[PDB]
Amino acid sequence: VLNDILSRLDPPEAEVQIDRLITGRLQSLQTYVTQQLIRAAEIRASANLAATKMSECVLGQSKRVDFCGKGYHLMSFPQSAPHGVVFLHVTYVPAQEKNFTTAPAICHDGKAHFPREGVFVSNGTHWFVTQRNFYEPQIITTDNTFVSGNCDVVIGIVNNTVYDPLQPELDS
Amino acid sequence: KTSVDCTMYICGDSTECSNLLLQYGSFCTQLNRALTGIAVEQDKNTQEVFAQVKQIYKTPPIKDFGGFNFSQILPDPSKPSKRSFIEDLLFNKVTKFNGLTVLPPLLTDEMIAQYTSALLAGTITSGWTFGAGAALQIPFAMQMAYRFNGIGVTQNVLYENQKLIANQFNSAIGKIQDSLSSTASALGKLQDVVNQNAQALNTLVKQLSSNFGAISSVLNDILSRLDPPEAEVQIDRLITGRLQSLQTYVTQQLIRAAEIRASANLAATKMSECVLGQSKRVDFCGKGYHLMSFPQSAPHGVVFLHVTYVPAQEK
Amino acid sequence: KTSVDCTMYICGDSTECSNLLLQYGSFCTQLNRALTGIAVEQDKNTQE
Amino acid sequence: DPLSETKCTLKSFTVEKGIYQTSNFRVQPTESIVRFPNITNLCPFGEVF
Amino acid sequence: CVNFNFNGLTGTGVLTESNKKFLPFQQFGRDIADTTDAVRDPQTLEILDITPCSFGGVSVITPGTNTSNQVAVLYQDVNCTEVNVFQTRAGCLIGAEHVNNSYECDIPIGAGICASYQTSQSIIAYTMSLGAENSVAYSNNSIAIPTNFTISVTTEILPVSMT
Amino acid sequence: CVNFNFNGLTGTGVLTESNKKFLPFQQFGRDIADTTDAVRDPQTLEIL
């Protein structure tokens, strides 16, 4: 207690006592300030991360994997909180899945057909082309698939027929 | 995960020194608390960097990966700790009782190897789906077709050049093997980290040999030689000096741990956006268009093998 | 890219002050080490 | 008890789940030993008395 | 463990038969970090290694006092001889029932060992599990495609500012 | 606000009639910082 030292000693040695006290308290203050500075650097890093998430997650739609919630990111909603923010990340997650036999491409007339968007699948007997994130089987035609070269090079090709929409119209 | 016992470091086996030290309040409590926080933070860093897969997938015995050869990154069933070739290279290319202790990491290297194996098997046998949700198998050729579509190159390019791409990938992996086996400095960063810490500790220990203005750096000699009235001042000097040295060491550790936390956050982001998926951020996952990545453990660190696509012959 | 001379700052041109300072051990060399590290970090920042 | 040790070291009557460090176990020295070279040297007091 | 005072030096530690070959004129050893390592006994021409006496932190593993008051004690980095006892790479654990079944880590101990309060109820220490294993039925002409889906809202919390 | 000195304990501050339920043997209170908080008047049986 500084008051006790001032009330109990004259300046000649009160100065030494107060010097010791001042040195101790100054060291404590410096330690506290350094701790605060390092923690503020931590919080600044977290705040930059939060700002980046708000920019690229709320004001848009991030395709960065796992950066905006587990699964495929749909959107985000921000919420305040005492000295922080809370993101509700709305994401799309496939739930029910089925096995299928698949082929990278199919011959029709020697030429090979590759799917524009989606993959070829077979339920055992027939072959469809379905988008790769949701089983939506569609008949294989020349507007779902594009030709390239011939089917002596691709590995794993399977035979099938590629229905052509223009042929029935031409016949009719 | 270093931890220092201030009472034994400052006042090794000396009741009077401890009584004098007890005047300085709660310095030890906050120093020990900071070091404990550092250790906890390191555990959290490793946990978040690696423990990103809900399950532990394992590759099937068949290696019909469209011609791709992963035998240099998948675990070796006949190996010291089920580590892959590149993992073992990384582990082999990186190299007391005075109140200083080294707490063990929560996740042993075997567990980190298992985590990298699970992530790698998921990436190989399911692509990116295993990150989003349930793992959905897919032939590797079709996964690479997805990736090529992802980089604006139509898929037929792959299927017409499948063997060439597989051979090029194998050659690249072999070149990486040779580079890692030949040049030890490649893992510099990791080594550097280790080095720095050691130096810190050494410096701290060397501070026990400084008199800080006292008559001798040895506490016992001061106690046995001088009378208590002046030995008290001498031990006050020694305690101030040793406390200042400890504070400097703790502050340096805090700053270096902030650096390492930033590095670990960057590594976690890279693993999430690079391995579990396919990044479209330029120069964030290797020079060129990014195709995929493979993680590999390392002592207190991670190593990404970035597989990327680079146009070569221009007309 | 600052750099501070510990001995010359604390004990500018004085043998006795330097001899008293060197009793504290490595309280000076590590400051120079840190500042050189800072300078190298700046150069690496610019090059990156 | 160690639980009370944790209670005081945290300055609270209630402790949340976790692992805390409270003190240091150190084996104490059972006895003391003093070692010096052989007392070969001898002052010539026998000559005088 | 003895408190010793050789010719001019004093310290505390355990003296053990050494493996070094001191020169005929060397007395006190020294480690790399300017620490006494071995000494030459003044009477017997034998070199004694000085290993400082065992010590380590005493961690108290506890479930929250709200639920129960039973605790376990971990003596860090010591054998269980110098103290239902578990010898782990982290040290000696007392009061923890060692089980074989793996579970998610609750109170981390170290070296892959975590402790927790579980069922009649007691504290157990176990090698933490990384998750249920699984095998993907991968084959060169098989693809698994989803048929349904779920919209999941997750929660990510980030601190922004201090006081 | 006055410069007070009770039985040798010196301080500066305002003295306000306190509602604290001091026990008959307690002479004065303290704050967590080891500083006086409330005192019982030596001359009058009052706590402030």
Ligand SMILES: *[C@@H]1O[C@H](CO)[C@@H](O[C@@H]2O[C@H](CO)[C@@H](O)[C@H](O)[C@H]2NC(C)=O)[C@H](O)[C@H]1NC(C)=O
């Ligand atoms: C695979 O899908 C095809 C197309 O839906 C199935 O073929 C049809 O089966 C229904 C009976 O469920 C018939 O009414 C249609 O005439 C069939 N169409 C064709 C073009 O064949 C086929 O049965 C399915 N196979 C399996 C094993 O489920």
Ligand SMILES: *[C@@H]1O[C@H](CO)[C@@H](O[C@@H]2O[C@H](CO)[C@@H](O)[C@H](O)[C@H]2NC(C)=O)[C@H](O)[C@H]1NC(C)=O
């Ligand atoms: C898809 O059908 C064609 C027929 O149009 C198959 O081509 C035949 O291949 C055999 C070799 O297995 C040859 O002996 C025949 O001469 C080929 N026929 C023609 C008309 O070229 C082709 O093999 C089938 N694909 C698969 C995977 O069985």
Ligand SMILES: *[C@@H]1O[C@H](CO)[C@@H](O[C@@H]2O[C@H](CO)[C@@H](O)[C@H](O)[C@H]2NC(C)=O)[C@H](O)[C@H]1NC(C)=O
């Ligand atoms: C994947 O590549 C590795 C080498 O990069 C192959 O292993 C080699 O196999 C040959 C033939 O038995 C041996 O002579 C070499 O010594 C092996 N090298 C190593 C490093 O093991 C491996 O066989 C390849 N995988 C497949 C499926 O072919």
Ligand SMILES: *[C@@H]1O[C@H](CO)[C@@H](O)[C@H](O)[C@H]1NC(C)=O
């Ligand atoms: C696909 O077949 C495998 C057989 O190896 C089976 O284990 C798996 O459950 C099947 N997929 C689904 C969605 O049932």
Ligand SMILES: *[C@@H]1O[C@H](CO)[C@@H](O)[C@H](O)[C@H]1NC(C)=O
């Ligand atoms: C796929 O693997 C089977 C063995 O299970 C083999 O018979 C078949 O030829 C393979 N197909 C391709 C395209 O490699």
Ligand SMILES: *[C@@H]1O[C@H](CO)[C@@H](O)[C@H](O)[C@H]1NC(C)=O
């Ligand atoms: C294209 O033409 C320029 C000059 O017109 C020439 O310098 C360049 O080498 C050419 N590109 C290639 C690939 O040869």
Ligand SMILES: *[C@@H]1O[C@H](CO)[C@@H](O)[C@H](O)[C@H]1NC(C)=O
């Ligand atoms: C010291 O004296 C003891 C007996 O008192 C003897 O055994 C020992 O050899 C002596 N040592 C030397 C170096 O003379």
Ligand SMILES: *[C@@H]1O[C@H](CO)[C@@H](O)[C@H](O)[C@H]1NC(C)=O
């Ligand atoms: C003198 O000799 C006697 C033996 O009679 C012996 O006891 C004594 O110690 C000797 N004096 C001194 C000073 O050594």
Ligand SMILES: *[C@@H]1O[C@H](CO)[C@@H](O)[C@H](O)[C@H]1NC(C)=O
């Ligand atoms: C303590 O446990 C009770 C259940 O008996 C629960 O209602 C309460 O919220 C718990 N308190 C804390 C602080 O965990």
Ligand SMILES: *[C@@H]1O[C@H](CO)[C@@H](O)[C@H](O)[C@H]1NC(C)=O
């Ligand atoms: C603990 O015991 C093991 C074998 O029981 C032994 O190898 C080890 O040296 C002991 N620990 C110490 C500090 O001596």
Ligand SMILES: *[C@@H]1O[C@H](CO)[C@@H](O)[C@H](O)[C@H]1NC(C)=O
């Ligand atoms: C655990 O399994 C080992 C064999 O792997 C056995 O020796 C030990 O008794 C078992 N302990 C318990 C508690 O089941």
Ligand SMILES: *[C@@H]1O[C@H](CO)[C@@H](O)[C@H](O)[C@H]1NC(C)=O
């Ligand atoms: C998808 O899951 C929901 C459960 O939320 C279920 O009600 C629905 O029938 C499922 N759809 C299909 C096609 O199975």
Ligand SMILES: *[C@@H]1O[C@H](CO)[C@@H](O)[C@H](O)[C@H]1NC(C)=O
């Ligand atoms: C003297 O002090 C006593 C007790 O402190 C008190 O009761 C009394 O009134 C005081 N006398 C005067 C004249 O104030």
